[PDB]
Design a protein around this motif. Sequence first.
Motif, short mmCIF file in Angstrom:
data_model
loop_
_atom_site.label_atom_id
_atom_site.label_comp_id
_atom_site.label_asym_id
_atom_site.label_seq_id
_atom_site.Cartn_x
_atom_site.Cartn_y
_atom_site.Cartn_z
N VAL A 45 0.75 -1.26 -0.02
CA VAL A 45 0.10 -0.03 0.08
C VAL A 45 0.81 1.08 -0.10
O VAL A 45 2.07 1.23 0.38
CB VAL A 45 -1.07 0.09 1.24
CG1 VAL A 45 -1.79 -1.14 0.90
CG2 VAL A 45 -0.21 -0.28 2.47
N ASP A 46 0.18 2.34 -0.23
CA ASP A 46 0.78 3.81 -0.44
C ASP A 46 0.48 4.41 0.88
O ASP A 46 -0.78 4.69 1.25
CB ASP A 46 0.16 4.49 -1.53
CG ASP A 46 1.21 5.80 -1.46
OD1 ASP A 46 1.65 6.27 -0.56
OD2 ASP A 46 0.79 6.65 -2.66
N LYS A 47 1.43 4.57 1.92
CA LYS A 47 1.06 5.32 3.23
C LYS A 47 1.46 6.67 3.29
O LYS A 47 1.96 7.15 4.55
CB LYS A 47 1.71 4.48 4.30
CG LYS A 47 1.05 3.35 4.53
CD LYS A 47 1.53 2.30 5.56
CE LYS A 47 0.67 1.14 5.88
NZ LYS A 47 1.17 0.15 6.95
N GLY A 48 1.96 7.28 2.12
CA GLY A 48 2.42 8.66 2.29
C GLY A 48 4.08 8.73 2.29
O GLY A 48 4.48 9.70 2.63
N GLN A 49 4.63 7.47 2.41
CA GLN A 49 5.98 7.80 2.47
C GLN A 49 6.79 7.63 1.23
O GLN A 49 6.20 7.65 0.19
CB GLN A 49 6.47 6.41 3.10
CG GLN A 49 5.88 6.27 4.58
CD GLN A 49 6.42 7.35 5.52
OE1 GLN A 49 7.48 7.66 5.43
NE2 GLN A 49 5.36 7.97 6.11
N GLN A 50 8.10 7.63 0.98
CA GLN A 50 8.65 7.70 -0.42
C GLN A 50 8.70 6.55 -1.12
O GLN A 50 8.65 6.54 -2.20
CB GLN A 50 10.20 7.95 0.14
CG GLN A 50 10.60 9.26 0.75
CD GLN A 50 10.22 10.39 -0.14
OE1 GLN A 50 10.66 10.43 -1.35
NE2 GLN A 50 9.46 11.41 0.62
N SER B 1 -2.43 6.48 15.21
CA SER B 1 -1.72 7.62 16.20
C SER B 1 -0.34 7.94 15.51
O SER B 1 0.04 9.01 15.76
CB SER B 1 -1.53 6.80 17.56
N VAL B 2 0.08 7.24 14.64
CA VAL B 2 1.40 7.65 13.82
C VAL B 2 1.35 7.57 12.48
O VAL B 2 1.79 8.68 11.80
CB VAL B 2 2.56 6.45 14.34
CG1 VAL B 2 3.59 6.82 13.63
CG2 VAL B 2 2.54 6.52 15.87
N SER B 3 0.92 6.52 11.76
CA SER B 3 0.97 6.54 10.50
C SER B 3 0.03 7.34 9.51
O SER B 3 0.33 8.09 8.50
CB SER B 3 0.70 5.09 9.79
OG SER B 3 1.68 4.35 10.31
N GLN B 7 0.54 10.90 7.02
CA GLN B 7 0.23 10.69 5.55
C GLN B 7 -0.55 11.93 5.27
O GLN B 7 -0.44 12.71 4.27
CB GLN B 7 -0.80 9.62 5.26
CG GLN B 7 -1.17 9.63 3.67
CD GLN B 7 -2.08 8.19 3.56
OE1 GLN B 7 -2.44 7.58 4.46
NE2 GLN B 7 -1.93 7.84 2.43
N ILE B 8 -1.42 12.67 6.19
CA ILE B 8 -2.15 13.95 6.17
C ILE B 8 -1.07 14.86 6.30
O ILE B 8 -1.36 16.08 5.28
CB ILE B 8 -3.25 13.85 7.10
CG1 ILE B 8 -4.36 12.63 6.95
CG2 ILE B 8 -3.90 15.40 7.13
CD1 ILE B 8 -5.27 12.89 7.99
N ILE C 8 -6.81 8.52 0.94
CA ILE C 8 -5.96 9.90 1.02
C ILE C 8 -5.04 10.01 -0.07
O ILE C 8 -4.88 11.17 -0.74
CB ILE C 8 -5.09 10.18 2.41
CG1 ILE C 8 -6.03 10.06 3.45
CG2 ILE C 8 -4.34 10.92 2.39
CD1 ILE C 8 -5.35 9.88 4.93
N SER C 9 -4.56 8.84 -0.56
CA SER C 9 -3.40 8.88 -1.56
C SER C 9 -4.10 9.43 -2.99
O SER C 9 -3.55 10.11 -4.07
CB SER C 9 -2.60 7.66 -1.93
N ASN C 10 -5.28 8.95 -3.09
CA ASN C 10 -6.10 9.24 -4.41
C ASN C 10 -6.49 10.78 -4.56
O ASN C 10 -6.40 11.36 -5.40
CB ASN C 10 -7.35 8.56 -4.62
CG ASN C 10 -7.09 7.07 -4.76
OD1 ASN C 10 -5.80 6.74 -5.21
ND2 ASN C 10 -7.93 6.31 -4.66
N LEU C 11 -6.74 11.35 -3.03
CA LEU C 11 -6.92 12.53 -3.05
C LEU C 11 -5.70 13.45 -3.47
O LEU C 11 -5.41 14.52 -4.09
CB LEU C 11 -7.48 12.90 -1.83
CG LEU C 11 -7.42 14.74 -1.32
CD1 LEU C 11 -8.46 15.44 -2.18
CD2 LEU C 11 -7.63 14.70 0.36
#
Lengths: 51, 31, 31
Positions: A45-50, B1-3, B7-8, C8-11
């Motif tokens: 998945v994509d978790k907003g990391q690099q 709590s962390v991930s 992301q946001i 969120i990633s789609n946004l």
Amino acid sequence: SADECYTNPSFSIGSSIYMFSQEIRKTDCTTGEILSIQIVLGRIVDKGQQG
Amino acid sequence: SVSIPAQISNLQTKVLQKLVYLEESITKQCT
Amino acid sequence: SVSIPAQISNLQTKVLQKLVYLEESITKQCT
């Protein structure tokens, strides 16, 4: 645990899911007792990391 | 709590700076 | 772990490319 050794990994990626397996041996890592074998199923998945 | 919080917050950073570039672009291009 | 991260990633993707179109639109229209 210092008396536990993780070895003989097996990893494969499908379409969205992955399979991962690892053996836990006692101390020796090569010829030691097998304490357990663990299999994990999950997704990439994509978790907003690099990556 | 962390991930999810991570992301946001990363989203907020990326969007805001893109908006900054647009603000400068308008000023430079339209003068 | 899966669904929310996807939403969120789609946004992020949709917003950023809309901002790209605006950047090009300004350059083309204002020249």
